[PDB]
Amino acid sequence: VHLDPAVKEVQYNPTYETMFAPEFGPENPFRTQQMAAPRNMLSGYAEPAHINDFMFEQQRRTFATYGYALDPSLDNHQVSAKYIGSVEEAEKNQGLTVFETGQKKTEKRKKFKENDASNIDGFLGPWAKYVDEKDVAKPSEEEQKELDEITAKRQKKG
Amino acid sequence: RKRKRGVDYNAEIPFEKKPALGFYDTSEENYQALDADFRKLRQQDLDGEL
Amino acid sequence: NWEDADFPILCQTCLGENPYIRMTKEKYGKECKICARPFTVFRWCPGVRMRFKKTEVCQTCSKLKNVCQTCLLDLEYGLPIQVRDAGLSFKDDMPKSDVNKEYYTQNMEREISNSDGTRPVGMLGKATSTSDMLLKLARTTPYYKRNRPHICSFWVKGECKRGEECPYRHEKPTDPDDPLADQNIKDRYYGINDPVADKLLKRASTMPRLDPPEDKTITTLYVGGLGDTITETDLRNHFYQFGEIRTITVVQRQQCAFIQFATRQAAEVAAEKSFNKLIVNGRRLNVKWG
Amino acid sequence: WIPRLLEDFGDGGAFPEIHVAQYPLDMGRKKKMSNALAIQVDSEGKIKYDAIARQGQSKDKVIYSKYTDLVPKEVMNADDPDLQRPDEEAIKEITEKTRVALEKSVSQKVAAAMPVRAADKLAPAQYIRYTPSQQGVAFNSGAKQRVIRMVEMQKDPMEPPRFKINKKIPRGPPSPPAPVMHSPSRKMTVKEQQE
Amino acid sequence: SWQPPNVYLETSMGIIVLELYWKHAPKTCKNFAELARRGYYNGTKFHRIIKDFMIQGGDPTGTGRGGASIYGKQFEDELHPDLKFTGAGILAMANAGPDTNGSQFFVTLAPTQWLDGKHTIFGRVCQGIGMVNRVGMVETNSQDRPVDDVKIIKAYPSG
Amino acid sequence: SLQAPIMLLSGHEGEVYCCKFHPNGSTLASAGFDRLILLWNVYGDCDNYATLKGHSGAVMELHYNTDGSMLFSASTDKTVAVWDSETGERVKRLKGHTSFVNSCYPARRGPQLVCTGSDDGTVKLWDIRKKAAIQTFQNTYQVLAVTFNDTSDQIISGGIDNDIKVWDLRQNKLTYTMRGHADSVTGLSLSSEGSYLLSNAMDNTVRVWDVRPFAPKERCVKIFQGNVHNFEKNLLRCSWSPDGSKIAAGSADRFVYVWDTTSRRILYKLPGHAGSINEVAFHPDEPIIISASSDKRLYMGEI
Amino acid sequence: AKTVTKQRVESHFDLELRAAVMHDILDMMPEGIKQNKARTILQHLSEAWRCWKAN
Ligand SMILES: [Zn+2]
Ligand SMILES: [Zn+2]
Ligand SMILES: [Zn+2]
C-alpha cells in the first residue's frame, strides 16, 4: 500500500503490509496465458535455484526409476507439502527413494558367472550376459516381408 | 544455376525497408497491377524511347 | 553475429515429463537450421525411453515466430506455424533467399537487442487478437510420442547385432507413400506447404461454426439446449453487450429460446461469439437459425 | 431519459441505468485493424508530433524537434548551482562504474591474445528454477515449476574452429533520422550565385 | 450527511465534471464527496490508464495498491441490479475483490461484461468527455503506467 | 535504525547453517556447511577479521555465552570445538558422540555447562572442565535441537518423534512431553526471560510453548504460519528478539518471516535470498536482522 | 586496416590532400550553392600542381 508494484531491488527494508498487498482494480483483457503469467523470456520465468545436489539427484532418479517425486515449487497452492508424479505408487511404496533400502525384493534375473580368470576364453567377470535374454533380434515372419515391401517402395522413388 | 546472390531480385524485395507508419491508417488501401497485354508489348516499350 | 544465450525456449512435451532435468550447455555448438549463424546448443534427456533432444534453431528464430527451438511448434497453442498463420495474418514475410535472409536477420536481431528481450517482436500486436479456431483443435495433453528413438536401420535390413541393447526402436517405419513424410525443416519453419498443417486445416474446415440468417433481416435466434435450471433475466445481462435487444421469445417446454435484435448484424455476431463456445450456468447454450 | 444518439449526451457519459448499448463518443465494437500509431497528447501541451520523430528510438531518448529548442536561453547570470558539474563524489562514482564496465570488455578482448596458456577449467554446474508458463494438468507431470541442472559442455583443446566467419552482408539501416533544427535558409542572390 | 450534486474535477488536461448516483449507491457517493471535500485528491494522479478500457485514478501514493477511506481501508459493495457497465464515461469504484474498496475510482471507456459482473457503479461523467478521451490517449508501458503526470490539480464537491 | 539499511555479507563457500549476534551486538560470527565460521564487525563497514578453523564437519550449531566471551559451535563429525571470541583459538574440545552432532547450547548464568544432541539418539551434558560427559540421555530416535532453561535445571530436546521432551538434571527422568507437531522438530529456542520456547517443524507450523512451574498442562500457547519446509530437509532454526516482541524463523522458500510477539502477525517477510534460509538472528540492541542462507550470502536488514 | 608502408606513401598523401580540399570547399561555399562543382575544383588543383612542376 506504500510501494511501487515492480521496479526491483528495494533499498530499504520493507514491511509485509507495504509490499505484499494485492494490486487494486480489474485485470486487463488484453493478455493471454503466456502474457498474464509472470514470464521472464518468452516461455516462462527462470530464476537461479540453489538446491542441494544429492537431494535433487535423489528425487530425479526416484522419478526416473519409479515415476514420482516431491514438488520443487516455491509456494504453489500454499501448503507445507505434496507429491508430484504417479501419486498412486508413492503412497503404495511409502514414498521411498533409490538411495534407500527397498521394500520390494523379489524376481531377480539370472546370469552367468565364471569369476576365476584362470580359464582362457571362459572368463566373464562383470561382462556376464543374462541367461534368458539373447542377442541378435531378427524381427518376425511377416515383418521381414513388409520391410522388404517398404524398402522396395523406397526403391521406386530415386 | 550456380551463384550465391542474383536470384533474390525477382523472388522478393531485396533489402526491404518498410515505410514508417504513423498518425494515418494506411492498411486498407492498395495499388492495381500493370496490364500485361502480351500481344503488343515489346522490350523497347517497357524501357521507353532512347 | 553469434547468439550466446542462457536457458533455451522450450515447450513442455519436448522438455520431458520429469520436473528434474539435466541438460548440458555448449557455447557455440551447432549452426541454426534456418539462420545458419551459430548459437548455444542445449541438450537434455526428456525421460527414460526418449531420444536426447536438443535445440535446433536460435533464440532469434524462435523470437521472430513464437515457437519452440526443437519441435518448431507454437509455445502457446502447440500447432504448426502454417496453421497459426492461417488462423492469424502473415505479415512477417521473412526472406528465404540467402543475402536477404542474413540482412533481415541482422536487422531484426538489432531490433531485438535494441529492446528488452522478452516479447514476440512483431507477433505481439497480432497476438493480442486471438482465440480463433486454433484454440479448438489445440492439443490438451502432451504428445510424448515425438520424444522417441529412431528406427534401427540395421534392424530394417535384419542385421541388428545389438538386439535388446540397441536403444533404437524395432518397429515399423512409416510408409513413404504418404504426404506426411516429406517434411522439410524450412518448409515447416516458413509456413510453406507443411502436410501436418494441411491435415490440421482440413480438420479445421469440417468443424462447426456460426451461420448466416436463412432470410434477410431476420434476427430470430432458435436456441436449443436451454435447460430448466436457468433464468431469462440473466440472458439479457449476458446479451446486452451487443446493443438494444429486440424480441425475446421464451419456450421452456422444448427448452428453446427465440431472440430478436435491432439489426441482423448483431444476430450474426451473437451466433459467432455464441456458437460452439458460450456456456453460462455451467451448462452449454446451443444456438441455431430458425 | 432518452439516449438514442450522440446528441442527447451533452458532454458525454453513458447512463448505466438505461440497459441499452449506448456509447458517447465513437467507441465502436468493431474497430478494424488500423496501423496508425495513436495520436497521443502530453499532460497539458499540444499533440505530440514528436512521436513521428521517434520511430525506432526508446521513450527516454532525448531528441529536439520543436521551435522552443531553437530560441536562446537567458544570460544565466553568475555562479548558479544550476550550471555546475554535478558532484566530485558523483564524479568518482561514475568514474568507478565506467572503469569497471570498460575493464570487463578489455579482458574479453585480451582473452583472444593468448588463447590457451593455462587451458580453461570449468565446473560451476548450477541450478535454475523454471516456471513453464503454459500450465496443464498433465504437462509437467503434475507441477507448477521444474528444476534444471545446467553443466557447461567440456571443450576439446585439440579442436579447430567450427564454422566460417568470413561471410559478409551489407551495412543495415542507421537509427531514425534526427530533425535538422536549422536556421531559415539565408537568401541567395543571382549575382553571388554567378560570382 | 448531505447529498451534493455533480463533482468538479480539475485535472492536468482540463476540467471534468462527474455526475454521481445518490440513489443506487449513496455510501460510496458520501465517501467520495467527503474525500473530494477534505482535499485528498489535490495532487493525486491517474495512476493506471489502459487505452479504450478505463482510466483508474486517485491514490496518495500513486501506486495502484494504496489508499484508505473515512471508514478505514475497506467498506462493502453496492451491487445494484439496475446499473450495468455499458458505454464510455461511467464513473466507478476500483476493486480488490468482493466487498473491499478503498479510495480509487475509474472512468470506464468501453462496454464490458466482467465489469458489471464484479464491480459497483459509482456514477458517470457529465461535462468533459473530451478531456477524458485525451487522458485515454496517454503513452503507456508494460504495466500500463503513464510516462508523464496526468494528475488532478483541484477538486470541488459542488452543488 | 543504526547504520543499517540492508548491506550484504559474503565470503562463505557453502550454506550458512547458523549465525548469532555478539552478546555486545557490535560484532558477529557465523558458520555453516563450509566448515568455516565467519566474524565480520557489524559496525563501520561490516568486515570479518578472525576466522576459526578446526572442524571436520558442518558447523551445524553456533552459539554464544551471556557475556559472549566464549563461543561454542557444534559440528557434523561428532566433536564440539570451544573457541573464545578474542584470539580465536580452539580452547576446549569435547568428544563423546558416536554420530553427527546436530546441535549445542551453553547454559547462561550458572556454572559453565554445554548440551549436545546427535544422530545416535543421545543427549549429553558437558562440563567444560572435565573432558568427559556428565550425563547421557538415551532417547531412541535422532535428536535435532536442544536448549537449557534459565535455571539450568532442565534440558529441552526436539527430535524426529514430533514430541519435545524435557529432562530433569536431578532425577534424570523424562519429566515432560509436548504433543502438537505432526512432524520432526528442527529448531528450538528459549525466550530471554525463560518464559517461552519457540519451535520449527516439518509439520508446517511454528509453535510457541510456555514452560513454567505452574503450567496450563496443554502448552500450545500460540501457532504461526507461513514457514515452508521441502525436500531439502534442512535444519531450520528460529530466534527471539532481544525484547521478546518478535519471532523470526527461516524457511525453504527464501522468505524471512518475523511475526508480532503479542498478536502473532507477520511483521516482516523480506526477500533478497536466493537459496533456502537456514537461520535468522536479531541484534541485541538495535532493530537489525542477520539472515543466513544456502546461497552463501548474508544480509543485514534494518527495521 | 592496411598500413601505409612504403609503396602506398605517395598514393596516401595524394588521397588525403583531395579529402582536405573536399572538406574545405564544402565549408567554403555559401548557403545557396547547388553543392555540385567539387570535381572541377579538384581538376583545377591537379592542373595547378602540374603547372607548378612545369614552372
Ligand atoms: Zn536462428
Ligand atoms: Zn518443443
Ligand atoms: Zn536395433
UniProtKB/Swiss-Prot annotation, chain C:
* Protein role: Required for pre-mRNA splicing as component of the activated spliceosome. Involved in the first step of pre-mRNA splicing. Binds directly to the internal stem-loop (ISL) domain of the U6 snRNA and to the pre-mRNA intron near the 5' splice site during the activation and catalytic phases of the spliceosome cycle. Involved in both translocations of the nuclear SLU7 to the cytoplasm and the cytosolic calcium-binding protein PDCD6 to the nucleus upon cellular stress responses.
> Which intervals hold domain RRM?
219-290
Keyword Cytoplasm belongs to the record: yes
Gene for this protein?
A: RBM22
Zinc finger residue ranges, C3H1-type: 146-173
Family of this protein: Belongs to the SLT11 family.
The subunit field of the Swiss-Prot or TrEMBL record says: Component of the pre-catalytic and catalytic spliceosome complexes. Component of the postcatalytic spliceosome P complex. Interacts with PDCD6; the interaction induces translocation of PDCD6 in the cytoplasm. Interacts with PPIL1.
Q: Where in the cell is it found?
A: Nucleus; Cytoplasm
The main place the protein resides is nucleus
Could you give one GO CC term from the UniProt record?
Answer: Prp19 complex
Q: Per its record, what are the GO molecular function terms? A: calcium-dependent protein binding; pre-mRNA binding; RNA binding; U6 snRNA binding; zinc ion binding
The protein, known as: Pre-mRNA-splicing factor RBM22
Question: Where does the record place the modification Phosphoserine?
Answer: 89
**According to the UniProt record, what happens if one changes residue 157 to R?**
Accumulates in speckle-like structures
UniProt crosslink position (Glycyl lysine isopeptide (Lys-Gly) (interchain with G-Cter in SUMO2)): 126, 136, 277
Entry note about domains: The C-terminal RRM domain and the zinc finger motif are necessary for RNA-binding.
Whether Transport counts among this entry's keywords is: yes
Keyword annotations: Acetylation, Cytoplasm, Isopeptide bond, Metal-binding, mRNA processing, mRNA splicing, Nucleus, Phosphoprotein, RNA-binding, Spliceosome, Transport, Ubl conjugation, Zinc, Zinc-finger
Where in the sequence is N6-acetyllysine found?
A: 199
UniProtKB/Swiss-Prot annotation, chain D:
Compartmental location = Nucleus
Specify where the region named Interaction with PPIL1 lies, as residue ranges: 10-30
Residues that the record marks as modified (Phosphoserine) are: 133, 141, 175, 183, 185
Biological processes, Gene Ontology terms: cellular response to retinoic acid; intrinsic apoptotic signaling pathway in response to DNA damage by p53 class mediator; mRNA splicing, via spliceosome; negative regulation of DNA-templated transcription; negative regulation of transcription by RNA polymerase II; positive regulation by host of viral transcription; positive regulation of mRNA splicing, via spliceosome; positive regulation of neurogenesis
Segment Disordered: which positions? 160-184
Q: Which GO terms describe its cellular component?
A: catalytic step 2 spliceosome; nuclear body; nuclear matrix; nuclear speck; nucleoplasm; nucleus; spliceosomal complex; U2-type catalytic step 2 spliceosome
Per the UniProt entry, the signal peptide is none
Top-level division of the source organism's lineage: Eukaryota
**Record keyword Lipid metabolism present:** no
Q: Does the keyword Transcription regulation apply?
A: yes
Query: Glycyl lysine isopeptide (Lys-Gly) (interchain with G-Cter in SUMO2) crosslink: positions?
Result: 32, 48, 66, 73, 92, 109, 121, 144, 191
Keyword list (alphabetical) reads: Acetylation, Host-virus interaction, Isopeptide bond, mRNA processing, mRNA splicing, Nucleus, Phosphoprotein, Spliceosome, Transcription, Transcription regulation, Ubl conjugation
- GO molecular function annotations of the record: enzyme binding; Notch binding; nuclear androgen receptor binding; nuclear receptor binding; nuclear retinoic acid receptor binding; nuclear vitamin D receptor binding; RNA binding; SMAD binding
Q: What is its main location?
A: nucleus
Stated family: Belongs to the SNW family.
Question: What is the protein name given in its UniProt record?
Answer: SNW domain-containing protein 1
Swiss-Prot record, chain E:
The PPIase cyclophilin-type domain sits at 3-157
How activity is controlled: the entry says: Inhibited by Cyclosporin A.
State how changing residue 102 to C affects the protein, per the record.
In PCH14; uncertain significance
Note one Pfam family from the annotation: Pro_isomerase
InterPro entries noted in UniProt: Cyclophilin-like_dom_sf, Cyclophilin-type_PPIase, Cyclophilin-type_PPIase_CS, Cyclophilin-type_PPIase_dom, Cyclophilin_A-like
Q: Name one GO cellular component term.
A: catalytic step 2 spliceosome
Residue numbers of Phosphoserine PTMs? 142
Q: Which reaction does it catalyse?
A: [protein]-peptidylproline (omega=180) = [protein]-peptidylproline (omega=0)
Write out the similarity annotation. Answer: Belongs to the cyclophilin-type PPIase family. PPIL1 subfamily.
| Disease involvement | Pontocerebellar hypoplasia 14: A form of pontocerebellar hypoplasia, a disorder characterized by structural defects of the pons and cerebellum, evident upon brain imaging. PCH14 is a severe autosomal recessive form characterized by progressive microcephaly, and poor or absent psychomotor development with severely impaired intellectual development apparent from birth. Other features may include hypotonia, spastic quadriplegia, and early-onset seizures. Early death may occur in some patients.
Protein name (Swiss-Prot/TrEMBL):
Peptidyl-prolyl cis-trans isomerase-like 1
Q: What species is given as this protein's source?
A: Homo sapiens
Tell me what gene encodes this. Answer: PPIL1
Swiss-Prot record, chain G:
Q: Which domain of life is it from?
A: Eukaryota
**What is its subcellular localisation?**
Nucleus; Nucleus speckle
Query: Which tissues is this chain's protein expressed in?
Result: Widely expressed.
Q: What does this protein do?
A: Plays a role in pre-mRNA splicing as core component of precatalytic, catalytic and postcatalytic spliceosomal complexes, both of the predominant U2-type spliceosome and the minor U12-type spliceosome. Functions as a scaffold that mediates the ordered assembly of spliceosomal proteins and snRNAs. Required for the assembly of the U4/U6-U5 tri-snRNP complex, a building block of the spliceosome. Functions as a scaffold that positions spliceosomal U2, U5 and U6 snRNAs at splice sites on pre-mRNA substrates, so that splicing can occur. Interacts with both the 5' and the 3' splice site.
The subunit field of the Swiss-Prot or TrEMBL record says: Part of the U5 snRNP complex. Component of the U4/U6-U5 tri-snRNP complex composed of the U4, U6 and U5 snRNAs and at least PRPF3, PRPF4, PRPF6, PRPF8, PRPF31, SNRNP200, TXNL4A, SNRNP40, DDX23, CD2BP2, PPIH, SNU13, EFTUD2, SART1 and USP39. Component of the U5.U4atac/U6atac snRNP complexes in U12-dependent spliceosomes. Within the minor spliceosome, which acts on U12-type introns, interacts with PPIL2 and RBM48. Core component of U2-type precatalytic, catalytic and postcatalytic spliceosomal complexes. Found in a mRNA splicing-dependent exon junction complex (EJC) with SRRM1.
Write down the species: Homo sapiens
Shown residues in whole-protein numbering: 669 to 723 of 2335
